[PDB]
RNA sequence: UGCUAGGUGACCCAAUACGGGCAUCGGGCAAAACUCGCGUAGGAUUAGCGAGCUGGGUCGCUUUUUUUUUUCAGCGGCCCAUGGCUUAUCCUUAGCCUGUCUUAACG
């Protein structure tokens, strides 16, 4: 609901720090819980439907079939960078992004 | 592989009588050569490595030789898995360690 609010409001700045605090503590919680109780980890990111976000390294891929996804660069504003990360780790938000993109492109047409 | 001692000689030299060289065998211990575990000058005004930059298969990788058992590497050619590192590369200083001097010691 905050990412819906935050394509709605762009120039908000105070609890966007709090938005970062939720994203970072959620990352801490998954990366702890995978080490701690793996069945609960898999259970939750199947029920919510989330990918793996755990950590010259590999992000715990399988034995074979080593499909990969790594992004490293070779001055920004806020929401122009905080939007595609939160789109990137979460597939439901990517689905909402492509759905509202098709919605606006066929609503303007 | 290299030394020293042995034992052999259808060989050569020496011998008022006998030992040396020369070939081969094998006992003793030995070097050599390779591999990896770590250590190691600073520089971001060196940030990507202009590269096979790492790995797997295939050969080529110039010898059989005592009983159940025995023989490295990208080093080159070919495919191929697309990865390997990130003080990685690049620069400039510099042989390295024990040493010697000092400090009470650490340095």
A67 nearest nt, CA–C1':
B82
Buried b (16+ CB within 10 A) or exposed e, A54-88: eeeeeeeeeeeeeeeeeeeeeeeebbeebbeebbe
Residue A41, judged by CB atoms within 10 A of its CB (0-12, 13-18, 19+), counts as: buried
Q: Stated in angstroms, how far is A4 CA from B49 C1'?
A: 43
A50 DSSP 8-state letter: -
Solved using: cryo-EM
Q: Whose CA is closest to A71, among A88, A87, A86?
A: A88
Q: What share of chain A is helix, strand, coil (3-state, %, to 5)?
A: 65, 0, 35
Q: Whose CA is closest to A41, among A50, A30, A49?
A: A30
CB-side neighbour CA atoms (13 Å) of A16: 18
Q: Stated in angstroms, how far is A69 CA from B48 C1'?
A: 20
How far apart, in Å, are the Cα atoms of A46 and each of A15, A24, A53, A70, A99? 29, 20, 13, 22, 22
């Amino acid at each position: 609901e905050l990412v819906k609010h935050f394509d709605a409001n762009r120039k908000e700045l105070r609890p966007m720090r709090e938005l970062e605090i939720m994203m970072n503590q959620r990352r801490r919680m998954l990366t702890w819980l995978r080490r701690a109780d793996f069945e609960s980890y898999a259970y939750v990111i199947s029920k919510l439907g989330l990918q793996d976000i755990y950590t010259x390294x590999x992000x715990x891929x399988x034995x074979x079939x080593x499909x990969x996804x790594x992004x490293x660069x070779x001055k920004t504003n806020l929401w122009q960078r905080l939007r595609p990360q939160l789109l990137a780790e979460d597939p439901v938000l990517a689905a909402q992004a492509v759905a509202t993109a098709a919605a606006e492109k066929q609503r303007q047409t």
